PDB file of C-alpha atoms and ligand atoms in Angstrom:
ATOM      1  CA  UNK A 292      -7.514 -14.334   7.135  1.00 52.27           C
ATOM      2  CA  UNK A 293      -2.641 -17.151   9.009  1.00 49.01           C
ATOM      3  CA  UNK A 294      -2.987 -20.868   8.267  1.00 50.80           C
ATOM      4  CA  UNK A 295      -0.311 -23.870   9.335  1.00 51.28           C
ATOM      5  CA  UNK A 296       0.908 -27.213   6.295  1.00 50.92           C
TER       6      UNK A 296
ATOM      7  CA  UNK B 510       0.195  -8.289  22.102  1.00 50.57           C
ATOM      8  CA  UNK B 511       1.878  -9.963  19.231  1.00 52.19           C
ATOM      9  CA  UNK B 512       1.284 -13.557  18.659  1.00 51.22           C
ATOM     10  CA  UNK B 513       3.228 -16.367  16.592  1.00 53.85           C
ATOM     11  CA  UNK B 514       2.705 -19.724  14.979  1.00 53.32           C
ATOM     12  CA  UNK B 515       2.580 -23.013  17.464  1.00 55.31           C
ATOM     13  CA  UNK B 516       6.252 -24.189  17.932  1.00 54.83           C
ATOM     14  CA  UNK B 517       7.216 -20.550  16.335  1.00 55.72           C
ATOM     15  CA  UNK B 518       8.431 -21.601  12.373  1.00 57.13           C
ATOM     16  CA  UNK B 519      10.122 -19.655  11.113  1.00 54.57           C
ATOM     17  CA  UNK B 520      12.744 -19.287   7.849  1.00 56.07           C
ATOM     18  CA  UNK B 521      16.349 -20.565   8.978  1.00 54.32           C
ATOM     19  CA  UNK B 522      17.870 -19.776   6.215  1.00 55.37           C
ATOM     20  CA  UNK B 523      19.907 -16.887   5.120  1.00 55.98           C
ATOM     21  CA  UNK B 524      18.411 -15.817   2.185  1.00 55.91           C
ATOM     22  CA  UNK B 525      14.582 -16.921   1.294  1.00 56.53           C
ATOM     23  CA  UNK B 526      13.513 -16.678  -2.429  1.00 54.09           C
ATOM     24  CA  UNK B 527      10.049 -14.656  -3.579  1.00 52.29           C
ATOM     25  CA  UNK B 528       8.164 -14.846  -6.761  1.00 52.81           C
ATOM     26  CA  UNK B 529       5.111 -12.995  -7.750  1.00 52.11           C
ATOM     27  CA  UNK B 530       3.467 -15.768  -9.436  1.00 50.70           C
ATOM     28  CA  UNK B 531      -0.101 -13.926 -10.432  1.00 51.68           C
ATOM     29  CA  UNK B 532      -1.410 -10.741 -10.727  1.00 54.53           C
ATOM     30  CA  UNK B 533      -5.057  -8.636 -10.507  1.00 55.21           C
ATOM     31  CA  UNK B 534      -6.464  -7.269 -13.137  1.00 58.01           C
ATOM     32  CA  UNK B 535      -6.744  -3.831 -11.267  1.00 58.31           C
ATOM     33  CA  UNK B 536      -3.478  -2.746 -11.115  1.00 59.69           C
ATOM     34  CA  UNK B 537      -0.454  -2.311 -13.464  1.00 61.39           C
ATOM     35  CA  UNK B 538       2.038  -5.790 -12.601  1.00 62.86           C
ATOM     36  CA  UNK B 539       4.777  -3.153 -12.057  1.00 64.87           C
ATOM     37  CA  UNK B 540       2.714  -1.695  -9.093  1.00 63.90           C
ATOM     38  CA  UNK B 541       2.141  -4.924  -7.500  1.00 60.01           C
ATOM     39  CA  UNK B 542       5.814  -5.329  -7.907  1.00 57.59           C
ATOM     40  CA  UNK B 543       6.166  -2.270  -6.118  1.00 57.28           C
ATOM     41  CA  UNK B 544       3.998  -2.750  -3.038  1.00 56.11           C
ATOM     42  CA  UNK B 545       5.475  -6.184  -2.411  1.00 54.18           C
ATOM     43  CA  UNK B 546       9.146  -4.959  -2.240  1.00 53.12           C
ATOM     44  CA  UNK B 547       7.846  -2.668   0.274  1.00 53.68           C
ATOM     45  CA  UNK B 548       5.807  -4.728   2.126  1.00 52.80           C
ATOM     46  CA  UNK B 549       9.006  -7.360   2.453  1.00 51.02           C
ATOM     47  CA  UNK B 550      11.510  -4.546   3.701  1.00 50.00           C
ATOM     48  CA  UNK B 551       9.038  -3.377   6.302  1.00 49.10           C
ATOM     49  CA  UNK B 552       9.475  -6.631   7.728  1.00 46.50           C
ATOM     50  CA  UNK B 553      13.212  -7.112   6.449  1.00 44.19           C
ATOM     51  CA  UNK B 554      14.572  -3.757   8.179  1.00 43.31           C
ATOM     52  CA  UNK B 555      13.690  -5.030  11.381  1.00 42.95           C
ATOM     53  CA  UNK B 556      15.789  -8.177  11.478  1.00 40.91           C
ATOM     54  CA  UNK B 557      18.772 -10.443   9.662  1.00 42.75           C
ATOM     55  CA  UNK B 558      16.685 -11.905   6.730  1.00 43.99           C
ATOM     56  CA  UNK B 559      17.236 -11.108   3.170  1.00 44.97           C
ATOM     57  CA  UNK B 560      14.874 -11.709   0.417  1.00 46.46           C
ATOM     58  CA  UNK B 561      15.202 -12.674  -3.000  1.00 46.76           C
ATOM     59  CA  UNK B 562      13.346 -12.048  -6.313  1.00 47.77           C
ATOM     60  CA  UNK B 563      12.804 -14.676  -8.738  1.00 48.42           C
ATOM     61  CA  UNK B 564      10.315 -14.629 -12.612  1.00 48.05           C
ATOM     62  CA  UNK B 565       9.993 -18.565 -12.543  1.00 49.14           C
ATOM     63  CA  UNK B 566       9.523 -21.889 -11.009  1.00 47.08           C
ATOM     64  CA  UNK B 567       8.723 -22.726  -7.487  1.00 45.30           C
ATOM     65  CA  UNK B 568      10.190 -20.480  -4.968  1.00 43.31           C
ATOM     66  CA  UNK B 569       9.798 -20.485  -0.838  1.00 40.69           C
ATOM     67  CA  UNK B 570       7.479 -17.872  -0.896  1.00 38.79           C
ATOM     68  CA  UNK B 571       4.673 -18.107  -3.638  1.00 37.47           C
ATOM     69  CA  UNK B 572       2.798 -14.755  -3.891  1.00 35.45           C
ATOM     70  CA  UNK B 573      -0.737 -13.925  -6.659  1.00 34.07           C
ATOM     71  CA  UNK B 574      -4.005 -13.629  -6.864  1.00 32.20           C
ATOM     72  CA  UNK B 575      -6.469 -16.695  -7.817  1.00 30.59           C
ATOM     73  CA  UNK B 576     -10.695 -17.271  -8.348  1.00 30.48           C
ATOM     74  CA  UNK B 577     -11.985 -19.346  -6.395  1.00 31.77           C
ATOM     75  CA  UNK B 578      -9.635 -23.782  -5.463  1.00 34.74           C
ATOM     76  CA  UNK B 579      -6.187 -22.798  -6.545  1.00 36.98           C
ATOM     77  CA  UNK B 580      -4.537 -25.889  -5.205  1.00 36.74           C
ATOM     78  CA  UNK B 581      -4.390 -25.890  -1.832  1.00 36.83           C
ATOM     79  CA  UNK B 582      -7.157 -27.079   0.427  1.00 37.05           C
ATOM     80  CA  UNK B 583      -8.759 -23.675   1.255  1.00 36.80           C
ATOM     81  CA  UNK B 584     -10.532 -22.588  -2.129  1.00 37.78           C
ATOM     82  CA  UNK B 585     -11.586 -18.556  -2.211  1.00 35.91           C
ATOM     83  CA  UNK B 586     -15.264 -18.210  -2.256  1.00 33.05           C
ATOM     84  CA  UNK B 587     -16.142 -14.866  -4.731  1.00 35.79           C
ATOM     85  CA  UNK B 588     -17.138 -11.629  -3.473  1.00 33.51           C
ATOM     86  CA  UNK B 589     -16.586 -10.899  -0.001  1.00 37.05           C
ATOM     87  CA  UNK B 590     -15.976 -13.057   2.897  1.00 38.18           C
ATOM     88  CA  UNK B 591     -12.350 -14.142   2.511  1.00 39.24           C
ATOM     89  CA  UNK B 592     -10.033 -12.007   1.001  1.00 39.18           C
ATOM     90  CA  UNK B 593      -6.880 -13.299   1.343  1.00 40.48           C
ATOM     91  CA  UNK B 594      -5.135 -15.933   3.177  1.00 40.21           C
ATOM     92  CA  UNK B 595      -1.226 -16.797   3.888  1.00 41.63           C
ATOM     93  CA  UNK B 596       1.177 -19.849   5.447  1.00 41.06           C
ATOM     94  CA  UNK B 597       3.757 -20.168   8.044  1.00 41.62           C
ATOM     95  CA  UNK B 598       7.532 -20.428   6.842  1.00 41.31           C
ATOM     96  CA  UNK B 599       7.579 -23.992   5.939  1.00 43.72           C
ATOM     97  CA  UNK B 600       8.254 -26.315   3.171  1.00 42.18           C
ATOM     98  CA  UNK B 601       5.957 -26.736   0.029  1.00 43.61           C
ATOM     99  CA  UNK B 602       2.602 -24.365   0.680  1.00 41.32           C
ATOM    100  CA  UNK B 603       4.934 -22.972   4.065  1.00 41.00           C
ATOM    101  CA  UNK B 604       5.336 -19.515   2.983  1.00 38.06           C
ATOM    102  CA  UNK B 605       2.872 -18.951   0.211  1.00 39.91           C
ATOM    103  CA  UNK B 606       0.031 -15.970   0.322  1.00 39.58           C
ATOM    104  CA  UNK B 607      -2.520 -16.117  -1.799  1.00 37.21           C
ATOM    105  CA  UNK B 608      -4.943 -13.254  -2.212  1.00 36.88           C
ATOM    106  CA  UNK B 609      -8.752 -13.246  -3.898  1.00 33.88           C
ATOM    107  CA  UNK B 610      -9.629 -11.969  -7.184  1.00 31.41           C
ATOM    108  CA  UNK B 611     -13.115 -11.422  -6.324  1.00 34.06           C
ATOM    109  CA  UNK B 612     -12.296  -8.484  -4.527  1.00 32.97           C
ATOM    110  CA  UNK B 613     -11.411  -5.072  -5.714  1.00 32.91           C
ATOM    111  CA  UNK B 614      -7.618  -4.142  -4.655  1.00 32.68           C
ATOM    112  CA  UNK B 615      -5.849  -0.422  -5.171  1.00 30.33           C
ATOM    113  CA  UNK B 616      -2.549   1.363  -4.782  1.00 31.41           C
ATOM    114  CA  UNK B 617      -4.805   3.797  -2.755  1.00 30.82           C
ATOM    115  CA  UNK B 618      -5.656   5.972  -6.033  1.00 29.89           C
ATOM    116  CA  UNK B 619      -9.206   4.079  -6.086  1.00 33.76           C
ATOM    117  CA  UNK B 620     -11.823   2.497  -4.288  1.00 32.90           C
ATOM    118  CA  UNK B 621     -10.812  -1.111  -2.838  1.00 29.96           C
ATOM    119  CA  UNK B 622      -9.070  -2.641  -0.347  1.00 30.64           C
ATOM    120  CA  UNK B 623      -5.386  -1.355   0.315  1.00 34.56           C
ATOM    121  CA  UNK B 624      -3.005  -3.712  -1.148  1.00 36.19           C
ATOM    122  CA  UNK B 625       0.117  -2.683   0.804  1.00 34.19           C
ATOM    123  CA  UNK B 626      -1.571  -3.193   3.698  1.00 34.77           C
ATOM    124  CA  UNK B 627      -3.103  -6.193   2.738  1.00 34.10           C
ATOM    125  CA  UNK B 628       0.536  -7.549   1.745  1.00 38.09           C
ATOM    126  CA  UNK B 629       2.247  -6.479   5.033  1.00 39.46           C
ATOM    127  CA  UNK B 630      -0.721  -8.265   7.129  1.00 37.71           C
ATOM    128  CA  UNK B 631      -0.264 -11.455   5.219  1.00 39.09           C
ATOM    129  CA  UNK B 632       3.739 -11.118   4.596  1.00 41.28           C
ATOM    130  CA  UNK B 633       3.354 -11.046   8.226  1.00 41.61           C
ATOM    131  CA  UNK B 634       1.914 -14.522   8.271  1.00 41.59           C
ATOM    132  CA  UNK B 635       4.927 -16.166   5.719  1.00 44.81           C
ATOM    133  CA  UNK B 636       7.631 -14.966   7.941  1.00 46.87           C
ATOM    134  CA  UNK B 637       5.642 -16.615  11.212  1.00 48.23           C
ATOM    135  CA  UNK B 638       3.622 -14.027  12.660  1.00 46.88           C
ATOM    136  CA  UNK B 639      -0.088 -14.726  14.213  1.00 45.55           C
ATOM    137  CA  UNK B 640      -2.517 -12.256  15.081  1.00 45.83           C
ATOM    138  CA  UNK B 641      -2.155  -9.658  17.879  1.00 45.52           C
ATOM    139  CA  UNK B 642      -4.531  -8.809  20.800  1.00 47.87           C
ATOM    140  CA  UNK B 643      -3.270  -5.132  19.909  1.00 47.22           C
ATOM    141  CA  UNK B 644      -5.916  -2.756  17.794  1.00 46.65           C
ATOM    142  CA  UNK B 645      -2.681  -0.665  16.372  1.00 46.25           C
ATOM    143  CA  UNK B 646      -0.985  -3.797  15.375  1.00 45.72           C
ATOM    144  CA  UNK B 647      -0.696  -4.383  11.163  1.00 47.45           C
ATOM    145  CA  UNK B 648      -1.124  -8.154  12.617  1.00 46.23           C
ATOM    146  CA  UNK B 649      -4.977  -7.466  14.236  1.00 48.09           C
ATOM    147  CA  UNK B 650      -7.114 -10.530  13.133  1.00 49.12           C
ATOM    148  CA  UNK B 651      -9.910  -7.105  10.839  1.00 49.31           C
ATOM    149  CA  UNK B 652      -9.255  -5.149   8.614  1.00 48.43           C
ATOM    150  CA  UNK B 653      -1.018   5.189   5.268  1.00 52.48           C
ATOM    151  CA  UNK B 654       0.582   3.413   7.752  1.00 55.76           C
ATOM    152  CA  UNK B 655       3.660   2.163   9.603  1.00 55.47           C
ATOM    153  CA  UNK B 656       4.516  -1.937  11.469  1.00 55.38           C
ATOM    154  CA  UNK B 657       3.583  -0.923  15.285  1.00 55.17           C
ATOM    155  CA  UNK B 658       5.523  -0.829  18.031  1.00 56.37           C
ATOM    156  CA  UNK B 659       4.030  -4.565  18.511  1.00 57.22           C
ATOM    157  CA  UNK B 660       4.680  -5.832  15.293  1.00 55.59           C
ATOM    158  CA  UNK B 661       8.064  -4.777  15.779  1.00 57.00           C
ATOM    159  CA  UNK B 662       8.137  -6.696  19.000  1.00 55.58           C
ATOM    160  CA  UNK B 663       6.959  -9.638  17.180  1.00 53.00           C
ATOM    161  CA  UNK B 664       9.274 -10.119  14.731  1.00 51.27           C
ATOM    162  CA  UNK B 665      11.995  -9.302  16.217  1.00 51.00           C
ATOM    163  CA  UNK B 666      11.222 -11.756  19.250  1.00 47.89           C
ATOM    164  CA  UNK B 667      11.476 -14.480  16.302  1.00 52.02           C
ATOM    165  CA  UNK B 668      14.448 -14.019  14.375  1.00 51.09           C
ATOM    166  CA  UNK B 669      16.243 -11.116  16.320  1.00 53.63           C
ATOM    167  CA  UNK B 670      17.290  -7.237  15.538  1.00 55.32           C
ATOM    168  CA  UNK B 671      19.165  -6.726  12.302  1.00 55.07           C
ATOM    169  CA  UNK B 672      20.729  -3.948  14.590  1.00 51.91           C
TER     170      UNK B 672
HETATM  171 CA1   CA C 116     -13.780 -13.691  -1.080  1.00 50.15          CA
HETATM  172 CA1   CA C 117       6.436 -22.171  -0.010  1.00 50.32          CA
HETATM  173 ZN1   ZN C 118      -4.335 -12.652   9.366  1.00 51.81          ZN
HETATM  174 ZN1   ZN C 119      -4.557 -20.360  -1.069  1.00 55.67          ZN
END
């Protein structure tokens, strides 16, 4: 992969 | 060009703590040292953010390698496919970039994907940038090099020019 949490 | 995160995070802090938490069995630990410190300052040069090194505990950004559900909700899934995957700044997972042991990594001596890049691109992500529109960009969504003129852009649109 830029993941959001 | 350059993208960000919705509602642009990013680290408010002075100084944000890094610790290498895992490492691949393809390289020496010293040389994933190495490439991370230089990954970091590519970014760092660029802007008023200072980064430090820690050996234990829980710090804001978690760096290492892992097989397959490592504790967050996006487990790797062997050989191909994903190969890495990072978080915007942020509390708790915010931050952390993980990257998949099924793959085969190098300092650029070997055959494998190039680590240093690979860190940069996903460094990128833990200090709040998203993907770019722009094929030069370190920050394009595919896979010796330099941060573009758009990466530059980027970061220094979110957290300003260290000069
Ligand atoms: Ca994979
Ligand atoms: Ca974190
Ligand atoms: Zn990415
Ligand atoms: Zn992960």
């Amino acid at each position: 992969x830029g993941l959001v949490x | 060009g350059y993208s960000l995160f919705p509602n642009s995070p990013k680290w408010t802090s002075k100084v944000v703590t890094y610790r290498i938490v895992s490492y691949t069995r393809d390289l020496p630990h010293i040389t994933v040292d190495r490439l991370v410190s230089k990954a970091l300052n590519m970014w760092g040069k660029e802007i008023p953010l200072h980064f430090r090194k820690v050996v234990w505990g829980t710090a804001d950004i978690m760096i290492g390698f892992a097989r397959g559900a490592h504790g967050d909700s996006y487990p790797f899934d062997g050989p191909g496919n994903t190969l890495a995957h990072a978080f915007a700044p942020g509390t708790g997972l915010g931050g952390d970039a993980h990257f998949d042991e099924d793959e085969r990594w190098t300092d650029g001596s070997s055959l494998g994907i190039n680590f240093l890049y690979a860190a940069t691109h996903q460094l990128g992500h833990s200090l709040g940038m998203g993907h770019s529109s722009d094929p030069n960009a370190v920050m394009y969504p595919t896979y010796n090099f330099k941060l573009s003129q758009d990466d530059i852009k980027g970061i220094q649109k979110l957290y300003g020019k260290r000069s």
